[model samples]
Every structure is written in C-alpha cells, then in structure tokens.
Target: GNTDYDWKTFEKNARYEPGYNSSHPTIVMFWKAFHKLTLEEKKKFLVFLTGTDRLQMKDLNNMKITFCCPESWNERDPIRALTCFSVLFLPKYSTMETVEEALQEAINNNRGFG
Candidate 1:
C-alpha cells in the first residue's frame, strides 16, 4: 500500500550482514535464520530486502497488493506491505526469513560478520 520507510532510515545499518554483499563472493554456507528477528529488525530487514530484490517492486502499476495481517496482529493495519510475489513465481523469502538467514549465518562459528 505504501512504500515510505521512515524509522529504519539507518544507511550504515541498512544492508547485508557484514561481508555478505553483492560485490563479495559470499560466505557460501547459507542458513535459515528468519525465526529469530525482533519486530523492529524485521522492518529494517524489509527495507534491505526491498532494495535487493526486484520482485518487491516490479511493475505493480499493472498489478495489485493484497494485505493479510493476522487478527492477533491487527489485520487492517495499513502498513508498507512487504511482498515478494513477482508474477512468474513465488518469492525466495520474506523480510524475517531473509534477514535472519544472513545475520545468523554471520554469527555462526562466531564469524560476527557485523
């Protein structure tokens, strides 16, 4: 619905987990760490995700966004709906799933990529 991100405006804190960026080859060992993100971290993670994935903002003018918040979490909450559906296929991840994966991977074996 909205694309404005305000609270998570930290550029320095708004990217990949340490050594894992587009320029870098990668850590190779990916992990499923989305389960550990706090609410705030998740939002910032969405900002990073929106920037990285083209699917998050494709030609939406020809499409539409659907909101599905849980009642326990307040459904009609008109937030900046973070989506990953690109038309051709399902998304690789959600904000929580993607962010936590990199963050947890960095922390694995005490690499502390941060």
Candidate 2:
C-alpha cells in the first residue's frame, strides 16, 4: 500500500521552526535518512510523529506536520515527537546515519503519547 505517499511531497507540505525548513542541511539529511527506511520503519516513524500511520499524501494537503531544530539540542539529546501537535524536535546531527539510527531508536522506544 505504498500508493499516494511520497516523502519529497510530504517535506513540501510540512511546517518548520524559524531557522528550519525543508531546505536546511539538517532537514535534507533527515529526508535522506527517511528515504532509506523500510516500509515498516516508515510506518513506525509516522505513528511516532502523528498518532496514526494511516495517512495518505492527499491528507497532507489539509494537515501540517512540524519539524524544529533547536540550537540547544545536540548529539546527546534524543529527538522528541509531539504527537498531539504533529511536531518533531530534532537535533542538528551532522550525519544522515546518525539521524537514521536515532530516528529508528525513537520510533521503537516511544510507545505512548502525551
């Protein structure tokens, strides 16, 4: 059921913090990480960020996901998801591998929503 879903377009539909946008180097790196995720991993990632993973590309036109990279967050900090708000608080990790690993860890470890 990969129909009607695309990361490139999803990025285009997202909202961001003041200094963060789809084109930020860190954001670009995050997409690279996202692009490599398995379909199941992608499901977990979406569920971790949103409350459900049942969304389609068209649903994005009416909803806005948020991505924020706070300067205070660093390599030691874990990425945080505000599922209620559909926001992801990411650190400015320097590598796509690190971002992918951290994202996977977050997806697997966090179960309940606040």
Candidate 3:
C-alpha cells in the first residue's frame, strides 16, 4: 500500500497548489512509525497529535500545522491513513483559548479544537 501511493507525487501536487502550501515556515509534527495503531486508536492518537501539547493557539498566530507520519503507517490501515491525512487541516481553526491551553485541553479532552 505504501508503494502504491507515491508521496513524491503527492508532495509535487501540494507544491503546485496556490491557496495553501508548505514552502512557508509551516509547523510540522511527525509520529514515528505509526502503522501499529488501529482506526479508533489512530483517531484518539491524532486527538493527542493535533491537540494542545502538539498544537496550540499561540502557535497559530502566523503559522500552519502539518502532520506527517510514516507512509508505511497506512499499509493495512486505510482508515487511519485518512485520519492522518485529515490532520493537515485540523489546526487551521482551533478553538483553544491559548497555545498552552490548547495543548493542555488536547491532552485533557483527548481532542483538538478544529
């Protein structure tokens, strides 16, 4: 499955996109070897990933949040893959009070604002 999806091509597609791009000083967070988790597990995991500890409101003042995990993580877990892919847009409109608060709330509530 990992081989089936060419990240290089995906990256190229993103590079050409006009509205939003990563060439800027984007904030990226990567979870090493995340293929071991299940769908529900990944959702909960992402809640923590995009949640406060990882992403806070203060950090959003002039930055964008982008989540990157191993492509192999999607081998047999397409659901988790989708969830992880969706994480790219999670922090654009977070509801946390502050960066610190968002982080704390993410860990406390096990969920991100956006």
Candidate 4:
C-alpha cells in the first residue's frame, strides 16, 4: 500500500531536485541500463533478479541496505513495511548487477557516496 503510493511520490520529489541530485542520477542510470538491454536479455535478467528460488542472498541484503529504514515513530526497527515491499519490487524489473552499478555510479556522480 505505502510502497505503491509513496514510490511515485519519492520518484517525483527526486526529479524535482536541481542538477546532480542523488536520486536523479540513480533514476537516469537505471533507465539507461534497462533500455540498453535487448528484450530477451532484459526479460532474462529481470527473471534472474526476481526469481523466488534463484535470487542471491547478497542481492537481497543489498536491496535491504539501500532501502530499508524505519520511520521516526519506529526508528528502532531496521525493517519497515514500506521498504520491505520496495526492496522486493526493485529487482522485479532490473538485474541486480545493473541496479548496483547504476546506484554506485549515481551516488558517485552526485558526490553522495561516503
């Protein structure tokens, strides 16, 4: 519910930012990588990323690291309901490798990496 509703807002807010925003690079890179693949490659890559039994624990962990955090009211919880679904949905449309590379490049471009 929250993921479906809030992800659009999150993306929209990110797009509204000025140049070199963290989210902007990430979003752009993700789409670029996605569009660069052949249709068969894209489908296979996404299937590999999101398959119930084929997904790697490292990818799942990475997704969690990237997106999971509680709201202020539940700050002590490492996992949040909204983020759980977000993590699951993230790999459904893109390869984990591409997502990771894109995210890293985006952060680097934004000077947002620590």
By TM-score, who's the top model here? Answer: 2
Spell out the clash pairs found in candidate 3.
52-102, 52-103, 53-103, 57-99
Residues 1-114 of candidate 1 have per-residue lDDT tens digits of: 224332223222223433343233221111123223454444443433343433332322233222222324332222223336311111223344443454533223223312
Separately for all candidates shown, the number of backbone clashes (residues 3 or more apart, or on different chains) is: 0, 0, 4, 0
Q: Which one wins by lDDT: 1 or 3?
A: 3
Span of ten consecutive residues with least summed lDDT in model 4:
75-84
| lDDT-based ranking | 2, 4, 3, 1
- Residue pairs whose backbone atoms clash in candidate 2: none
Per-prediction TM-score, please? 0.22, 0.78, 0.24, 0.29
lDDT of 2 at 41: 74
**lDDT values, one for every candidate:** 0.31, 0.74, 0.32, 0.34
Residue pairs whose backbone atoms clash in candidate 4: none
**Candidate 1: segments with Cα more than 4 A from true spot:** 1-32, 51-101, 104-114
* lDDT (Cα, tens digit) per residue for candidate 4, span 1-114: 111122223333322223333354444545555444444443333333343433343443333212321223231211111222333112222344556454333323323222
Where is model 3 more than 4 Å wrong at Cα?
A: 15-19, 27-87, 90-114
RMSD of each: 17.0, 2.6, 15.3, 13.9
Which predicted model would earn the best lDDT?
2
Q: Which regions of candidate 2 fall more than 4 Å away from where they truly are?
A: 1-4, 56-63, 110-114
Give per-residue CA lDDT, model 2, range 3-113, as digits (tens): 456656676777887766678888888888777777677777777678656666566445567887676788756877877778888888888778888888887875444
